[PDB]
């Protein structure tokens, strides 16, 4: 078996994967320090969920890189086969190599469900490094959810303004007969860190950034960064039910 993983609670995996579920297919990376699931869309967007090996009660890989593509929606349906309102549900994940299916052993109350998901052969790499990040903002996630689940979707773009000057941090939408602005002062108690060196105004397709709301709702803190190119990086610090910290990343190209 190339990959062997086990959880006392499936929700430490399924919950995080739901935050990137906006394509029915997902590439899975499994290395020595955890599992990385990746979904992409129209070559501008990439969402990565990182569940480190420390989360699992048991985790073993030997080939230092085992990669496969699966149906993320089928995977999620299987992982939540015992109900989305549970009384835990254990998991044993098993994948042993190319051409062979992803095995899922879910148990609850002695009831055992066995899933066999077939795998295909698998990606974008946005060279987003910290050495060329221009603007960075860290925000308290909770005080921000209300708003971005409420951002105008009739607009085609989401315009993000970051600046050392007023209005400091601004999300703007442009629907029909409606210009809408969302402003956050660097003074705010929601601002945990404000490091904007240069005034930058970028535009991103709203349909591409909308699923990030799922990650935001789960997160307690969110990191927002832009670089010279204008590429966006959204990092969501997520605390699972075991108090452990996992991470979801969103990259997006400009318009």
């Amino acid at each position: 078996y190339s990959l062997v993983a086990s959880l006392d609670n499936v929700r430490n995996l399924s919950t995080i994967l739901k935050a990137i579920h906006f394509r029915e297919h997902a590439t899975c990376f499994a290395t020595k320090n955890g599992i990385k699931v990746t979904v992409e869309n129209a070559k501008c967007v990439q969402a990565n969920a990182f569940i480190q090996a420390g989360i699992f009660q048991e985790f073993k890989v030997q080939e230092e890189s085992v990669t496969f593509r699966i149906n993320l929606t089928v995977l999620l349906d299987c992982l939540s086969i015992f109900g989305s309102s549970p009384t835990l549900t254990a998991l044993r994940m098993c994948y042993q190599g190319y051409g062979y299916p992803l095995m899922l052993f879910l148990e609850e109350g002695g009831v055992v469900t066995v899933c066999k998901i077939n795998t295909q052969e698998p990606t974008l790499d946005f060279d987003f490094c910290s050495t060329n990040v221009i603007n960075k903002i860290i925000l308290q996630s909770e005080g921000l959810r209300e708003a971005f689940s409420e951002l105008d979707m009739t607009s085609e773009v989401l315009q993000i303004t970051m600046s050392p000057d007023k209005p400091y941090f601004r999300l703007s939408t442009f629907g029909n007969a409606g210009s809408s602005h969302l402003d956050y002062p660097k003074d705010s108690d929601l601002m945990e860190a404000f490091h904007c060196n240069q005034t930058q105004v970028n535009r991103y397709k709203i349909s591409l950034l909308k699923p990030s709301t799922k990650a935001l709702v789960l997160s307690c803190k969110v990191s927002i960064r832009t670089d010279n190119r204008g590429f966006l990086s959204l990092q969501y610090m997520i605390r699972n039910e075991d108090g452990q910290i996992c991470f979801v990343e969103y990259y997006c190209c400009p318009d």
């Binding site: 320090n33 990385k36 990182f50 910290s130 860290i138 860190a193 990191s223 610090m237 990343e249």
Partner: peptide, 10 residues
């Protein structure tokens, strides 16, 4: 590659 979390402050 794994994630490089940029959440360090204070």
């Amino acid at each position: 590659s794994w994630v490089s979390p940029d959440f360090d402050t204070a």
